[PDB]
């Protein structure tokens, strides 16, 4: 049932669909720098998702708590950043957890406490500076139709945030 439920869903304003590979679920306690414990539902294994939003789309390959490749197209800098934020949170990477600042106590529109993955999502939806700063950058190859993006959102032909590429298409 875990495979079935995680095959198609909405997260962070994006429709996710699994296109390849599998995972198993498990509950994993993590600790933010503010020493807050979050019990997250972790996907264990290699999978590939497509993400479709209002103003951006992405393709994501990930493994257990590790983003492998992310390609995003968007209408503008804002919508592209938004897609990158959701992918980074969804990746469940340690460096994303470690980018949290302060305590998370987000509530939905009925004033009920949001689940841990949504605590993370809400947090970084407000400001992704620490997230992008701590994610990491790498050298990239020059591939036609693709360009890198730095943590300050400036495009670069030489470097990019780790695993992240922006499609000109």
Author numbering: 315 to 483
Task: Quote the original article.
Within the influenza virus, three RNA-polymerase proteins (PA, PB1 and PB2), the nucleoprotein (NP) and the viral RNAs form the ribonucleoprotein (RNP) complex. PB2 mediates the cap-snatching mechanism; i.e., it binds the capped mRNA of the host for transcription of the influenza genome. Here we report PB2 middle domain structure (318-483) belonging to subtype H1N1 human influenza with m7GTP, which has two mutations (P453H, I471T) to increase solubility of this domain. The overall fold was the same as reported structure: a four helix bundle (α1 ~ α4) was wrapped by three parts of β-sheet ((1) β1, β2, β5, β6 and β7 (2), β8 〜 β12 and (3) β3 ~ β4).
Two mutations (P453H and I471T) were introduced because these positions are surface of the protein and far from cap-binding site. These mutations increased the solubility so that the final protein was stable in 50 mM Tris-HCl (pH 8.0), 200 mM NaCl. We collected the native data sets at 2.00 Å resolution with in-house X-ray generator and detector. There was one molecule in an asymmetric unit. This crystal contains large solvent content (70%), and two mutations P453H and I471T located on the solvent accessible surface in the crystal packing. However, compared with the reported structure of PB2 middle domain, in native, one large structural change could be seen: N-terminal region formed one additional α-helix which consists of 315SHMRISS321. The first three residues (315SHM317) are additional residues derived from pET15b vector. The side chain of H316 interacts with S336 and it seems to stabilize this α-helix. On the other hand, by m7GTP soaking, the α-helix deformed to a flexible structure as describe later. The final Rwork (Rfree) of apo and m7GTP-bound form were 18.6% (22.8%) and 17.8% (21.2%), respectively.
